[PDB]
Design a protein around this nucleic acid. Structure first.
Ligand SMILES: [Mg+2]
Ligand SMILES: [Mg+2]
Ligand SMILES: [Mg+2]
Ligand SMILES: [Mg+2]
Ligand SMILES: [Mg+2]
Ligand SMILES: [Mg+2]
Ligand SMILES: [Mg+2]
Ligand SMILES: [Mg+2]
Ligand SMILES: [Mg+2]
Ligand SMILES: [Mg+2]
Ligand SMILES: [Mg+2]
Ligand SMILES: [Mg+2]
Ligand SMILES: [Mg+2]
Ligand SMILES: [Mg+2]
Ligand SMILES: [Mg+2]
Ligand SMILES: [Mg+2]
Ligand SMILES: [Mg+2]
Length: 123
RNA sequence: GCGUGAGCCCGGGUCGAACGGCCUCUAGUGCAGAUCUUGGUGGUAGUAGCAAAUACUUCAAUGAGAACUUGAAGGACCGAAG
């Protein structure tokens, strides 16, 4: 179980999609700030896409925290997962994607010994 | 799943030989436009159309397949500045 923490509030779950990326396939959905002189999104017309702002920033107490209350730490081996020995209530280990199956099993066993949560343990 | 965001990480599939994090150093380093360059691909669309030069028809053979292959017969044109 994670450390006691204030409830996690996101202030927003949507992704801030790029303007007209829904209409043009040459445009990736990744956010781009519209620099056009006449742009309605830039000028903040009612009923349009919202632009990201620092006001959407998450609470400093719960930033980078997954819903279980843990912060993800990427591990590539057993020695990496052993760095979380003193942090099993604040940090959860995420096994790197390019780790072989046997090394994944070793990391999972060591994390079970240490009491460290693994976010992608099932395989 | 994380980040306000650019982005980052993971699960599954495909795949087959290299690759990444951190601190510095470096630059031919970030694209929707430029009637931009090269290449590829659409709707239009099975659409416009394939209509000058009189014209083809019967039987048989060949052949998987015959109006525009061939034989025979008929009907026609060029009509000696052909
Ligand atoms: Mg978000
Ligand atoms: Mg103006
Ligand atoms: Mg090879
Ligand atoms: Mg350049
Ligand atoms: Mg382009
Ligand atoms: Mg531009
Ligand atoms: Mg072109
Ligand atoms: Mg075309
Ligand atoms: Mg037609
Ligand atoms: Mg015509
Ligand atoms: Mg015709
Ligand atoms: Mg004719
Ligand atoms: Mg026959
Ligand atoms: Mg004919
Ligand atoms: Mg005549
Ligand atoms: Mg005559
Ligand atoms: Mg003469």
């Amino acid at each position: 179980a994670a450390k006691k923490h204030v409830p996690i509030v996101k202030k927003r779950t949507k992704r801030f999609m790029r303007h007209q990326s829904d209409r043009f396939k040459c445009l990736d959905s990744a956010w781009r700030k519209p620099k056009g002189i006449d742009n309605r999104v830039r000028r903040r017309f009612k009923g349009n896409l919202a632009m990201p702002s620092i006001g959407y920033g998450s609470n400093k107490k719960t930033k980078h925290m997954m819903p279980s209350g843990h912060k993800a730490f990427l591990v590539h081996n057993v020695k990496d997962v052993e760095l979380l020995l003193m942090h099993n209530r604040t940090y959860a280990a995420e096994i790197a994607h390019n780790v072989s199956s046997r090394k994944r099993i070793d990391i999972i066993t060591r994390a079970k010994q240490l009491g460290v949560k693994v976010t992608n343990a099932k395989a």
